[PDB]
RNA sequence: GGGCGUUAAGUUGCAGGGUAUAGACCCGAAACCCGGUGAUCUAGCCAUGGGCAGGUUGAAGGUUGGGUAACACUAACUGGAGGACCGAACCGACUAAUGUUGAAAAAUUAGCGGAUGACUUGUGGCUGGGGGUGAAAGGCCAAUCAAACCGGGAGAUAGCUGGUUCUCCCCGAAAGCUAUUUAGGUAGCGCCUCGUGAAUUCAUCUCCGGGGGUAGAGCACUGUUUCGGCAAGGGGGUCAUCCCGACUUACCAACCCGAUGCAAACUGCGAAUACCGGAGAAUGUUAUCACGGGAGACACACGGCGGGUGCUAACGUCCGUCGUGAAGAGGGAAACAACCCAGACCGCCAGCUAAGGUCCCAAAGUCAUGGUUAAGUGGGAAACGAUGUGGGAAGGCCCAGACAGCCAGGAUGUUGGCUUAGAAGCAGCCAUCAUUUAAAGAAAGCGUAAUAGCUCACUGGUCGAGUCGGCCUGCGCGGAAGAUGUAACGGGGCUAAACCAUGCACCGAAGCUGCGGCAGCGACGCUUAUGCGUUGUUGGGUAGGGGAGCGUUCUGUAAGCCUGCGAAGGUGUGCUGUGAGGCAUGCUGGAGGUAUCAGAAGUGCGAAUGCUGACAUAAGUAACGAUAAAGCGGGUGAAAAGCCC
RNA sequence: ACACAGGUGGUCAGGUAGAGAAUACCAAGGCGCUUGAGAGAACUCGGGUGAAGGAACUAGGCAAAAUGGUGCCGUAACUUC
RNA sequence: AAUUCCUUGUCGGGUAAGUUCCGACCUGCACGAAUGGCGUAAUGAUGGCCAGGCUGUCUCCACCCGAGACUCAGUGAAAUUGAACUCGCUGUGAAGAUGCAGUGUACCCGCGGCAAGACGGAAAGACCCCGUGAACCUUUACUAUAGCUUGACACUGAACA
RNA sequence: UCCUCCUAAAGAGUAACGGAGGAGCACGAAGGUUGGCUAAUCCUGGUCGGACAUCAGGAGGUUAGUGCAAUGGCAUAAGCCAGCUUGACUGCGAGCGUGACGGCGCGAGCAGGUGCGAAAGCAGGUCAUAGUGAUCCGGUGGUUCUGAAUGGAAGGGCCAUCGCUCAACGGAUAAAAGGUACUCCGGGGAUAACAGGCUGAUACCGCCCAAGAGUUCAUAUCGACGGCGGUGUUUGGCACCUCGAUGUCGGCUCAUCACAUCCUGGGGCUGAAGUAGGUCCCAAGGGUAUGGCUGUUCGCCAUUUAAAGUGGUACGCGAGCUGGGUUUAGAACGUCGUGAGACAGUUCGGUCCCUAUCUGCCGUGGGCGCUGGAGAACUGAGGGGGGCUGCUCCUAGUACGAGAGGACCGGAGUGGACGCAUCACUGGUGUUCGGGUUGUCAUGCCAAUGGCACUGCCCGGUAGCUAAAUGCGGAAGAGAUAAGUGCUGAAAGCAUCUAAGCACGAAACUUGCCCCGAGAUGAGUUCUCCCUGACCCUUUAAGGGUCCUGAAGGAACGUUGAAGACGACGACGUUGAUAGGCCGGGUGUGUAAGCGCAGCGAUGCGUUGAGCUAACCGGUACUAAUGAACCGUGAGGCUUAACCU
């Protein structure tokens, strides 16, 4: 059951901070949820200081008073924050008439309005699917009440159990085309075995900016909008560096907070490429104060997704705004998992960037001064080939000095191609 | 006036068609209720007696002292308690397994609980059916218990299931509408049948006299639509004198203009066919309608057409409308109710045809001629791919010689400027001209770090007729994988035995035709119940209606007649009719059977898980009753594993 | 329904070993259970023994294997003692 | 949790492996005090679970001993059956073919062995539905009444006041 | 229930849990009548006045207007205003419409009195259809109609009218709730639950288009939005097949096919350094994880292996088992119910029947066949089994690669699983082989020996037999092939793997190995061996009969077997080793008996490797296997030409 829940509909919202302990979205966050999403928003109406129920969520009382808002205000749907138990939505409907959703269905709602490669639908209707294997459970009342309540003759196993079994074959199945999918990235993966491969990838929440950066550091087309979701599908495009010239780039999805569990559990194949990749850049926003937070947000899919072990780089984008400083190197030591100064749209930070990369991808820099006597064409030949010359400089009668620095598999595969009996290189 | 009437042959039999009340054809329910029988099985209770081996624990208590004023404390010693243990007798059933047509309508074997107690048992007693009983389960109440057994109102009713017996000729349904405590029922009418009546009653064909709103078509309207319009109002705008306001709308969107379609519930049009009245001919047994006597039938399926629905599915459902089936046999499509052909009164070792076929199974063309197919297409299929091959129109090039290959040239500006280590025909970038010449692009491909080679585009020459394509089009390939065995021509097998067209022969059904019978039916003549005579015509059939019968048994008829020199009964035998049947005669029989025409019926059986009586069948199989075994010598004895010693 | 493997009350209690009216073997006393004989195949029944391993089997240690006795030694949580 | 749906919730303990279990945890889908809750000595032919032991349970089974199976003799059964000359493959078809089609194979006839089929036997589907079938209970279905409750009047008199 | 529109097929009429919708009244005027008026919407102008009120002027032609659904209706308006009015009367109805009927609709004219207009003439409810109830039993009112001895009266009818959501609307009655798991009765494939059958929306596999990513690149590999197919497995529908019964999930024995490929096998490309992969093609030969957890299939997990392939097969397999889940009665919890009661909410407990006729299956038989008869040896007509593979070194640290890393092919080894076969080894096993010993019994007693107690308990072991033991086995090479790679080579001067014609090419194909195998009804080969007698009548492919012959060979019985269920199949039957014996050896148990002698004794010491000894090896005619008899024969059918006479 591939079905879609509409987004784009009048709303009665209702949503409860107002909880005490756990916390969770202002409210605003959630309201971008509902914005992106397209939502008709109507109204807020909101709950008091409780711990949550085995009831209808909330209190009783509010509850009485989401009932009568919907009955009143029409409202198309009650979305309702903060995720429940099936049986939680099912007493809220009894108090109803319309879809209720999670925070959940949601997420997933916009998520597969938004998908649009091949690969995104199936992770995105896998997603789709193992939500929904949950809550049908109780559904069955209705469609045994129908059935008489004694008389399965034939079958032992009861019924609806084989509907959870028809969904269990479904979810198998999904996953099955999902496996040649993953192999079929990892073949474009073997291309990740030459020895030369910087692979970086960049990470935030949704409108971290990510989209921007990731432009003006390509100059390609990624576009970028207020909107959560402002990119799906990983994007891959070589960029420039100092001391390994080529340089794989991939953008992933942005995040939020307590984005869906199964959701991840699809969507490994997507982030298949940000396991490996050797570098976790990472952009976050400088307006919101939601700063610390959003970083515990990232964290914490990190963790569940491995290779959080992986070096980082910060980039407290949106420098714009707050005339932070001017940009700057921040060695966070000499480490340098830094800090880094940039506003992306404008962009200005960039070259202490790529720098600071530039000290921290290596692995050789014990440069030469080379040079020859005119037999050199092959030599500037050579580095205008592979890497860089440092330095070209003249010099009399045709002996020519320059200054070179490359990894080492550079120095071999050279020292053996070529006779270097030139010697400045090993 | 209008309604009924005015009107104008009935009644008693008798045979019979119904229909009414009764068991109304027979078989069959769960239960309902009344009168009776039980407590020997068990459940409970009552009196009265019995049963409970062996072992072990040790309360209370007692006795003696520590101990302390004493108490507490406490020694032992005895003391013998108890829904107590351990385990036989007796009780009881938890686990396995056999056995489950078993040895036994709950046993068997091995393991298990109680076992001095709310125990167990002798023997008698009392409680009874809507009642008893209940350590209560809805369990027991003679193995039967959610209300016993057993006799009677009892043929309880049964709108369901079953089945309902001898023969020919005639006719032929329906599976619908309305209503239905109705949906598998039944009723009114539709349809069949019979009997009576009457319009030339009707049906086809034509001609005339009609009506119309679907198909189609169409865009005013109805709503929809696309794009130009067009102005267009307008939130802007616009500008500025602040603004008089001008101006701008360059967005905005009507209204109307032009052309585009679209429609079950849009229509300024509008067919066929049907419908409907008149007219006429021929043709059909008045085919019509009215009436009276009887029905069943009320659930239809598929096919062609018109639809709804569905998924423009289903051997799907639901209507329309029509065909076969049902209830129709033949032939063909290999096998085929629902397709094509054709409605079997019966015979005939005659004939011709139908659809459909004709190299063999296998009936007839190895038919004629013309054309295509290269695949076994035929003998399973698409979007789609392509120097497959047939056909076609037209178009391009060319004997001033093309097309293919082949001889050679490939140019100067100028390595274009920019880029840059280097770019320059080929890192780019943008310019890319001008020249020469038949010829050559600042470039189509390779190459170089880059530079410089390498090939065509370009052409001369060469060579000598055709050459390059798009379009249309028949017929073919690619796409194209299935379950147990070739299995997607019936097979053999095909290269014509495929396929396209034309023609001739022939096969091929019960249809038709000749010959021969039989039967209705009308018919006019004949004739009178007559008979005929003639002729036309007809004769597949379940529900169901109608006509004729065959046969048994009794009664009349018979004190007839048949028979002992063989009646009835069995089993032969031939003779005979359209038939059920008769008739003849050998075998047994050893006693009775009934022409003829009447009379009446328990009157005709293959079926009901019919019912009794005889006998098949598995099979001469499984088994022969506990796995506590016998061996022997002698005895009688028709015989000795059994018995006698 | 039977010469059926079921049930049926009360009396009697020999030895030898052992607590014993169990078991073990015999007294007195009955009994060889009404079809056999041959043969030594699967399979079934009822059993006896296993090398290695030791519950991996299996719904589940089901079955089966596995402990017994007498005396002396010593005997936890917890205990309503 | 004998309570939970969700749910193999989370948590750690046990396991190489933990849908059970054990103990916490507390969003108790939908615990709660006589409709008794919380504990617990001992008690269980009780539910779940672990460890020690042994073990033909098994991994895979092997011979031995018994009684049936076999043959021989005597006896002498049943269940069931339209009729038998009662092959496969593949079609076909009231839609799962021994019986048709076309095709393939195959002397005549027992014995013991195996159980896929012969929609094999056994009993009128208990499931499901139908029927103006029945029974039994149920309660605020109706409609009746027993027992019960009020009141009259009669057996019922007397006086006063 | 009733009304309008589509479905509806140009008339009616026509259905669906098909498409839209209205209705249970309103009015004494919205009615009778004559007299007059005629629409929305639109432009200009104009006080508040405005997009939009009122007024003028035009425009325009009912797009307005109908008491409300809708559709047809509508200018002589029906719509509108106004006067007059009760025709929203009264008894009658030519004759029509649609109804099965009940019943419903229109109707002129007339009778009797109205009412309007001058008159003509207009009025028996409204523009039209929707606006509602039969029956009974009663009420109110009238009543020139009855009234039960007569006179009244009560009562009834006659006529007027009233009493209903009887709305499940043709209305079973004044009066009408649920539960069954305790179950029941008669039916049903006329309709469910299982499975098939039909179909493929679904699911599933390709296929086209190429938006894109895939570091540049659309097509190594992915493929967006979209299309056509295929398979007939998943879920569904469809209810034709079964309810006079087809047993249902999981496991457990057991396989069987497909190929839509899990490995191994062969190839194309690669984003193929090699290592490896990824796809694609070709391939069905064989092979393809034990455990944990839960009834599970799954799924998850731990560790493996080359691989842990898919799916079909009544979701293969209950007349083979299993009975954990599934669904009964017991009970409990939460929860819903006032309840009895239920719940797909969970937990506890809970009976698997069939001795095989047919079929087909596995063995193994007897009859007859094969042209006189045997006896042994055959050939191969056909059939089956057989098919896995790791891992190590050698090639060689080589080709590869900067390194790391590490090959191609060839060859050597050495295993897992599986199959085949023998006991010699290792053992297993051993109820007949020996010894130990508790219980007791008996043998007169005695130390001595037997009986019983699971074989009494145990101890080892021959033989037989068996894996756990041990050898052997799956090829090689040919033949013809796939996919692919080729040569040459034209049709088309060039091309070109193809048209011609050669070269390749794999666990697959056919052989190559083993087993089977003239019932191979085509009934075959070679070799051996045997019978070569007379007479009689009938029909003469023919005998028949006499008589006389009986052969090789067959058996029949018996001795027995490593042969065997029985049969069969061996070995032997006195010219003999087949058995049992018997003799020896061998074999294991472990040193006996009796006696001797140290010890009071239990016992011992020496007598002694003792005796004891199967299933065995070597030996031996002691017993048994005797001989007649019995089957079978007596010389071999015609044709046909060959060669010989
Ligand atoms: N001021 C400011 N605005 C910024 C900066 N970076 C991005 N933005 C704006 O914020 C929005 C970010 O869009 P986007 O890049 O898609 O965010 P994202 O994090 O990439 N989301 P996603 O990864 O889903 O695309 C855009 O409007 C972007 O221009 C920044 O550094 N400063
Ligand atoms: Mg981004």
Redesign the pocket.
């Known amino acids: 059951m591939?079905d879609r829940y509409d987004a784009g509909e009048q709303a009665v919202l209702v949503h409860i901070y107002f909880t005490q302990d756990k916390d969770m979205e202002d409210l605003q966050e959630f309201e971008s949820l509902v914005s992106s999403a397209g939502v008709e928003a109507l109204q807020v109406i909101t709950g008091s200081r409780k711990?949550?129920?085995?009831?209808?969520?909330v209190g009783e009382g509010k509850a009485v008073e989401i009932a009568e808002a919907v009955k009143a205000t029409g409202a198309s749907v009650v979305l309702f924050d903060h995720a429940?138990?099936?049986?939680?939505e099912?007493?809220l409907e009894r108090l109803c008439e319309c879809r209720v959703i999670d925070r959940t269905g949601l997420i997933l709602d916009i998520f597969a309005q938004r998908?649009?490669?091949?690969?995104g639908?199936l992770q995105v209707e896998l997603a789709q699917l193992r939500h929904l294997?949950?809550?049908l459970?109780?559904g069955?009342?209705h469609?045994?009440?129908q059935?008489?309540?004694?008389?399965?003759?034939?079958?032992?196993?009861?019924?609806?159990?084989?509907?959870?079994?028809?969904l269990?074959?479904?979810?198998?199945?999904?996953?099955?085309?999902l496996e040649?999918?993953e192999?079929?990235?990892?073949?474009?993966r073997?291309?990740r075995?030459?020895?030369?491969?910087p692979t970086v990838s960049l990470v935030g929440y949704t409108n971290a900016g990510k989209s921007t950066l990731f432009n003006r550091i390509t100059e390609?087309?990624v576009y970028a909008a207020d909107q959560l979701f402002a990119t799906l599908?990983?994007?891959?495009?070589?960029?420039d560096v100092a001391d390994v010239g080529?340089?794989?780039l991939?953008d992933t999805v942005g995040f939020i907070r307590h984005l869906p569990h199964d959701l991840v559990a699809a969507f490994k194949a997507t982030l298949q490429?940000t396991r490996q990749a050797t570098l976790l850049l990472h952009v976050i926003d400088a307006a919101d104060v939601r700063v610390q937070e959003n970083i515990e947000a990232v964290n914490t899919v990190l963790e569940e997704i491995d290779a959080h072990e992986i070096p980082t780089l910060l980039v407290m984008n949106k420098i714009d705004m707050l005339e932070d400083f001017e940009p700057r190197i921040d060695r966070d030591e000499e480490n340098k998992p830094n800090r880094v100064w940039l506003s992306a749209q404008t962009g200005a930070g960039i070259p202490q960037l790529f720098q600071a990369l530039t000290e921290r991808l290596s692995g050789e820099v014990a440069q030469h001064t080379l040079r020859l006597p005119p037999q050199?064409?092959?030599?500037?030949?050579?580095f205008?080939?592979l890497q860089a010359?440092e330095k070209?400089w003249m010099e009399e009668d045709g002996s020519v000095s320059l200054q070179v620095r490359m990894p080492?598999?550079?120095?071999?595969?050279?020292?053996?191609?070529e006779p270097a009996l030139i010697d400045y290189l090993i």
């Open positions: 591939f711990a949550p129920h085995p009831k209808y969520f429940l138990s099936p049986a939680q099912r007493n998908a649009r490669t091949h690969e639908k294997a949950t809550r459970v109780r069955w009342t469609l045994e009440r059935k008489g309540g004694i008389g399965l003759r034939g079958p032992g196993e009861t019924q609806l159990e084989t509907d959870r079994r028809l269990r074959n479904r979810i198998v199945q999904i996953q099955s085309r040649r999918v192999k079929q990235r990892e073949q474009g073997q291309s075995i030459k020895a030369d491969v390609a087309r599908d990983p994007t891959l495009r070589r960029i080529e340089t794989v991939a490429e050199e064409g092959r030599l500037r030949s050579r205008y080939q010359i070209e080492i598999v550079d120095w071999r595969r050279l020292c053996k191609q």
